[PDB]
Amino acid sequence: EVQLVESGGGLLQPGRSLKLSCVASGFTFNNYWMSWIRQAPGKGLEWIASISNIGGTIYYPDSVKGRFTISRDSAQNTLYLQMNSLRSEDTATYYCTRDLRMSDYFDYWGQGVMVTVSSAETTAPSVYPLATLGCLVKGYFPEPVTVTWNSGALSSGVHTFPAVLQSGLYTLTSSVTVPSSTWPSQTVTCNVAHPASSTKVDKKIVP
Amino acid sequence: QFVLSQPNSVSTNLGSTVKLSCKRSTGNIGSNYVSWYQHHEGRSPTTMIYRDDQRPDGVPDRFSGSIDRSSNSALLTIDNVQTEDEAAYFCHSYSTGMYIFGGGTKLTVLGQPKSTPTLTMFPPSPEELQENKATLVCLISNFSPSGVTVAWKANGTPITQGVDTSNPTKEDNKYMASSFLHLTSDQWRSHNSFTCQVTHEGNTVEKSLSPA
Amino acid sequence: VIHGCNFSSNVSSKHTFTDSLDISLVDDSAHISCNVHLSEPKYNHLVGLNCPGDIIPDCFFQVYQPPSNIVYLDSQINIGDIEYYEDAEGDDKIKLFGIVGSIPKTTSFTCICKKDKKSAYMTVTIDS
């Protein structure tokens, strides 16, 4: 069947270049136009580059001309996208598409490669107590970071909220709803685990 | 060049007919081919309508493409909507050198009844105040659909600087979201009012916090 | 002079084709034909195409057989000294090929030019 396996992205500091690759299978490679589609978090689909059957026609919008360069290799049946001088506004998911020119639509879509551009540093989180009790994990990178109550004592009642970028750093909160006769009659502990820095922080909530 | 405008989100019940519009800025929409794509959260997009009305093999016959020249728009009609249709829908058109896409329409299928959010406020921690830093937490839960816009008010005035809000994700049975407000240690205790407003389905739910 | 077909509407151009048909004035979903026929013993001609939109396929290096499969010109015409040229005048795309010498067998090929929903293809036939 038709498959568009794409790879070659990840996390890197701004200014560095990156070349995405998309190997195509299941169809004659030098007989169909191909394109790259970008989707940023919350901005929707955005076309960035397009190449013809053997590179006879090249297309970019007036927003990334000169900075991006689409390429094609027949000996490897591969579609390449060289993104030089990566900026913070380039963090998005990229897909490679086989489109049909005579019908003006993308027939097949690729797998999807995430590209994240940030000057952020791999640093340990900061845990704070919130008095329903809460544990606030602020200023951490990278993901994931988990928050368990009493080292996994009770499963039902704990709700952990997703993270959000504040100043190029993730931040989340984990809450639990407790009855009246339990708190503050019982000691409550919060264990926050971050595997990247291998940091386990234990906190307590007392008013 | 032209711009394709699409509504942000539309809500329709199960087993009904929905029509998604796609208006063109400049030029007649009938002159260029229109395509419709379905993009699910965390997955690659799939082609739904390739020509103006033709659909490819694999798309159910309930999906249909049409062109309304009276309003210079493209309509995607879905009869007997199923739960699997909850995804984003994108309108595309090519015009000699540029592939213009639409804004995108988040289709939400109404299966569960309407629910209003429940807010949980959290003031800055004492250890953070010893650190001279203020972070206010606003937890929103038990709300459907995900159409929710949050805001923060300091003593009644809308404060925009230092607001970080995540997106609603599927937890429990309804959506769930969090919001955070940055504030200076001394600027927090200066004014004795900080409210977290949540606008969902017309209901503007509010909850306050005071340093007293 | 170019023994080809011109589908562009730009009145000012440094290229001069033997046949010009404005594609912007024809009906939608209609197809225009522009046949080219060469029948001389030895050729030293330049045959090309000026399309105001897109070209299918990447033409004159790979061509469309007279749905059908895409072949390559160097093997269809069977001569390894075919020269290729290109140019761009705004949105207009000019693709040309110069041919020198004889040809072992009469051959024919086709190239499509599409702008919006309008599409028109030109055919080239070289008799040995």
Numbering used by the authors:
A (entry chain C): 1 to 131, 143 to 218
B (entry chain B): 1 to 212
C (entry chain A): 294 to 359, 366 to 427
Show me the paper's own sentences about this structure.
In particular, Pfs48/45 and Pfs230 form a Glycosylphosphatidylinositol (GPI)-anchored complex on the gametocyte surface and are required for Plasmodium gamete fusion. Plasmodium falciparum parasites that do not express Pfs48/45 are severely impaired in their ability to form ookinetes in mosquitoes. Altogether, this suggests that a vaccine immunogen based on Pfs48/45 will generate antibodies that target a conserved and essential component of the parasite life cycle and will prevent further transmission to uninfected individuals. The most effective monoclonal antibodies characterised to date, 85RF45.113 and 32F38 bind to 6C, highlighting the C-terminal domain of Pfs48/45 as a promising vaccine candidate.
For this, we set up crystallisation trials for a complex of a Fab fragment from 85RF45.1 bound to Pfs48/45-6C, which yielded crystals diffracting to a resolution of 3.2 Å. Pfs48/45-6C adopts a typical β-sandwich fold, which is further characterised by three disulphide bridges, two of which connect β-strands while the third stabilises the packing of a loop connecting β-sheets 3 and 4 against the core of the domain. While most of the loops connecting the sheets of the β-sandwich are well resolved, a large loop that bridges β-sheets β4 and β5 in Pfs48/45-6C is disordered in our structure, indicating flexibility. The overall architecture and disulphide pattern of Pfs48/45-6C is highly similar to the fold of the C-terminal 6-cys domains (D2) from the two other structurally characterised Plasmodium 6-cys proteins, Pf12 and Pf4125,30–32, both of which are expressed on the merozoite surface. Antibody 85RF45.1 approaches Pfs48/45-6C from the opposite side relative to the GPI-anchored C terminus of Pfs48/45 and the interaction is mediated by five of its CDR loops (CDR H1–3, CDR L1 and L2). These CDR loops form a positively charged groove, part of which binds to a corresponding negative patch on the apical tip of Pfs48/45. Indeed, the majority of the interactions between 85RF45.1 and Pfs48/45-6C are mediated by hydrogen bonds, from both the heavy chain and light chain CDRs. Furthermore, CDR H2 and H3 each present hydrophobic residues (I54 and M102), which form van-der-Waals interactions with hydrophobic patches on the surface of Pfs48/45-6C. The only two polymorphisms that lie within the epitope occur with low frequency (I349V, 0.0092% and K416N, 0.053%) and result in substitution by chemically equivalent amino acids, which would not be expected to affect binding of 85RF45.1. Therefore, 85RF45.1 targets an epitope that is highly conserved among Pfs48/45 from all characterised Plasmodium falciparum isolates.
